[PDB]
Amino acid sequence: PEGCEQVLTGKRLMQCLPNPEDVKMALEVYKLSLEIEQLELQRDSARQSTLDKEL
Amino acid sequence: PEGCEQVLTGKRLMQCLPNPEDVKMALEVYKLSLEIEQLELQRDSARQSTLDKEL
Amino acid sequence: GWETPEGCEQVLTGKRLMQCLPNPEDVKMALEVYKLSLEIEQLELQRDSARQSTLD
Amino acid sequence: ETPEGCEQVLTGKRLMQCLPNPEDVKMALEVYKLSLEIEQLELQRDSARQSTLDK
Amino acid sequence: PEGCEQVLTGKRLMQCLPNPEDVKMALEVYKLSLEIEQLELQRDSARQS
Amino acid sequence: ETPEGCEQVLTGKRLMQCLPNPEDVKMALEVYKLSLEIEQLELQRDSARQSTLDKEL
Amino acid sequence: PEGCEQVLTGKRLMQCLPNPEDVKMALEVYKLSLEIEQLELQRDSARQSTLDK
Ligand SMILES: [Cl-]
Ligand SMILES: [Cl-]
């Protein structure tokens, strides 16, 4: 049908792996990894504030 | 009733596939893929700046 | 002997929405799906308007 | 007893009594919240298809 | 150990009620209530504005 | 036998040892996080019931 | 597809530990810890506002 193009695209992605359920987890994990890296950067780039701002 | 238009729209989307439960997953997967891509861009466009910063 | 206590208007509203369908659990999914669809569309726009912007 | 620092918890607990089944309370709220968020998204969508017509 | 301070704090909160699982729900519900109120304000302040 | 790129994972794993049952660790954090988020929300709410007041009175 | 590269990357991460399900939890926990720290800072840097006036 029409309107379902988004769904089909997602469905196609679910075939990147044998268990489509594994696809979602893989992405969730990768996404976590990326978000964490940004968080680590913010944390460091703020301690680099306080450390210098102890100065 | 009336006020249920949003619900109906969602319900219609759930018919893009035989198993409506698959529809939600398909969308979640696609959404993950998009979000990840943006995260990758931000990551690259930041590693591209730490570099510039020291030249 | 039930009387709904005070400060529950939000709850009632949600409850009313749960009657848009025979099965209330189906209501939440329907909305979640629609919401996903909308968010995705926005994401697609941002993606296109970024492959385009800077393109010239 | 009930320790101090649990005021937030008690408030939530009180809300869970708006209905016979407390698990229904959380769902009711989640649904209403979804409805509100969707409405906002619909507005943004329209007010963007309109930027793209009105000029 | 150390670094576990956050965990301990959360653990302490889980003792606000006999069933710790009820604590998380209570908070989730309260949070929902607050978020909704904000959403309602934004909605009204847009139908107005 | 851990590869490289797994540093984030190891860190999380170490946190999971703050308590005997590891599943309890995640809940404890989720609860604490909720508490903090809520406090911020309450502040925003108060600082808006206050601000509109300053603007409109 | 530029689709499967993302998946592969995630899949590789799932091998940081013997049980891949543990990987996701470890990350979720770490992420929580980071978010909480930020929240604590915001809270303090706002109570430090409700001091000066
Ligand atoms: Cl409230
Ligand atoms: Cl993609």
Side-chain angles (χ1 to χ4, degrees), chain A residues 1 3-52 54-55, chain B residues 1 3-46 48-52 54-55, chain C residues 1-2 4-50 52-56, chain D residues 2-3 5-48 51-54, chain E residues 1-46 48-49, chain F residues 2-22 24-48 50-54 56-57, chain G residues 1-46 48-52:
Chain A
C4 305
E5 300 76 9
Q6 302 175 322
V7 177
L8 284 185
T9 304
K11 175 120 175 326
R12 241 183 265 135
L13 288 168
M14 270 161 70
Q15 304 174 342
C16 285
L17 283 180
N19 177 10
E21 233 131 296
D22 286 336
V23 176
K24 184 185 167 199
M25 277 193 49
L27 296 176
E28 282 179 326
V29 161
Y30 186 22
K31 183 188 173 194
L32 283 169
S33 183
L34 295 166
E35 294 178 307
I36 288 181
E37 187 185 31
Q38 254 180 19
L39 290 174
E40 285 176 330
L41 260 43
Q42 299 180 11
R43 189 196 49 182
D44 300 340
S45 137
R47 298 181 177 181
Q48 184 71 262
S49 140
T50 67
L51 235 69
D52 298 353
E54 260 277 303
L55 289 239
Chain B
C4 301
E5 301 76 10
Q6 303 176 322
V7 178
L8 283 186
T9 305
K11 176 121 174 323
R12 240 183 266 136
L13 288 168
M14 270 160 68
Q15 305 175 340
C16 292
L17 286 179
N19 177 14
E21 187 99 37
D22 286 338
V23 173
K24 183 184 167 198
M25 277 194 48
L27 295 177
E28 284 177 324
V29 163
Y30 185 22
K31 184 186 172 196
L32 282 168
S33 184
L34 296 166
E35 293 179 308
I36 287 180
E37 186 184 33
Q38 253 182 18
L39 288 172
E40 286 177 330
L41 261 42
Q42 297 179 13
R43 188 195 49 183
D44 296 341
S45 140
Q48 181 73 256
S49 291
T50 56
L51 275 38
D52 253 337
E54 50 182 4
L55 291 181
Chain C
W2 177 267
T4 308
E6 302 291 337
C8 298
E9 301 78 7
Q10 303 176 323
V11 179
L12 284 192
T13 306
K15 178 121 172 324
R16 237 183 264 138
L17 289 168
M18 270 163 66
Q19 305 175 340
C20 289
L21 286 181
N23 182 16
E25 206 110 337
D26 284 337
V27 177
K28 184 184 167 200
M29 277 193 48
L31 297 175
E32 285 180 322
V33 161
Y34 186 23
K35 184 186 169 195
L36 281 169
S37 187
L38 294 164
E39 292 177 309
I40 288 181
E41 186 185 31
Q42 251 182 19
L43 288 173
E44 285 174 331
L45 260 43
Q46 296 179 13
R47 188 195 50 180
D48 299 339
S49 139
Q52 180 76 262
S53 301
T54 71
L55 197 283
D56 246 21
Chain D
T2 45
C6 302
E7 300 78 8
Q8 303 174 321
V9 179
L10 285 186
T11 305
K13 176 121 174 323
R14 240 183 266 137
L15 287 167
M16 267 162 72
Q17 304 175 340
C18 286
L19 286 180
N21 175 13
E23 203 159 313
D24 285 338
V25 176
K26 184 183 165 201
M27 276 194 48
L29 296 176
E30 283 179 324
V31 161
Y32 184 23
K33 182 187 172 192
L34 280 169
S35 185
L36 294 164
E37 291 178 310
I38 289 181
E39 186 184 32
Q40 251 182 20
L41 289 172
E42 287 176 329
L43 261 42
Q44 296 181 13
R45 188 196 49 183
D46 300 339
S47 138
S51 151
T52 65
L53 292 176
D54 291 20
Chain E
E2 323 164 18
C4 303
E5 299 77 9
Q6 303 173 322
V7 178
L8 285 186
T9 304
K11 177 118 174 323
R12 241 184 265 135
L13 288 167
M14 269 162 68
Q15 305 174 339
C16 289
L17 287 179
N19 179 24
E21 192 96 28
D22 287 335
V23 176
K24 183 183 167 201
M25 278 194 47
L27 296 175
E28 283 177 326
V29 161
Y30 186 22
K31 186 187 168 192
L32 283 168
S33 183
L34 296 164
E35 291 180 308
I36 287 182
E37 187 186 31
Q38 252 182 19
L39 287 172
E40 287 176 331
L41 261 41
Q42 297 180 12
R43 188 193 50 181
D44 298 340
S45 139
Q48 182 75 260
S49 310
Chain F
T2 75
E4 313 142 345
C6 304
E7 300 77 9
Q8 304 175 320
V9 177
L10 285 186
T11 304
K13 177 121 173 322
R14 240 183 265 136
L15 288 166
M16 267 163 70
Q17 305 174 341
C18 288
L19 286 181
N21 174 31
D24 286 336
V25 176
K26 183 181 167 203
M27 277 194 48
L29 296 175
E30 285 179 323
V31 161
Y32 188 21
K33 181 185 173 193
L34 282 169
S35 185
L36 297 166
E37 289 181 312
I38 288 182
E39 187 185 33
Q40 251 182 20
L41 287 173
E42 286 175 331
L43 259 44
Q44 295 182 12
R45 185 194 52 182
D46 298 340
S47 139
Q50 183 76 260
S51 287
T52 300
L53 265 53
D54 296 337
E56 295 210 56
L57 282 162
Chain G
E2 284 174 355
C4 308
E5 301 77 5
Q6 303 176 323
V7 176
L8 284 188
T9 304
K11 176 119 174 324
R12 241 184 264 138
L13 290 166
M14 270 161 69
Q15 305 175 341
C16 291
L17 286 180
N19 176 21
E21 300 251 348
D22 285 337
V23 176
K24 182 184 165 200
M25 278 194 48
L27 296 175
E28 284 179 324
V29 161
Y30 187 21
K31 183 186 174 196
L32 282 168
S33 184
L34 294 166
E35 293 179 305
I36 287 181
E37 186 184 31
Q38 253 182 18
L39 288 174
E40 285 176 330
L41 262 42
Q42 296 181 14
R43 186 194 49 183
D44 299 340
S45 138
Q48 185 71 262
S49 296
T50 63
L51 297 192
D52 307 31

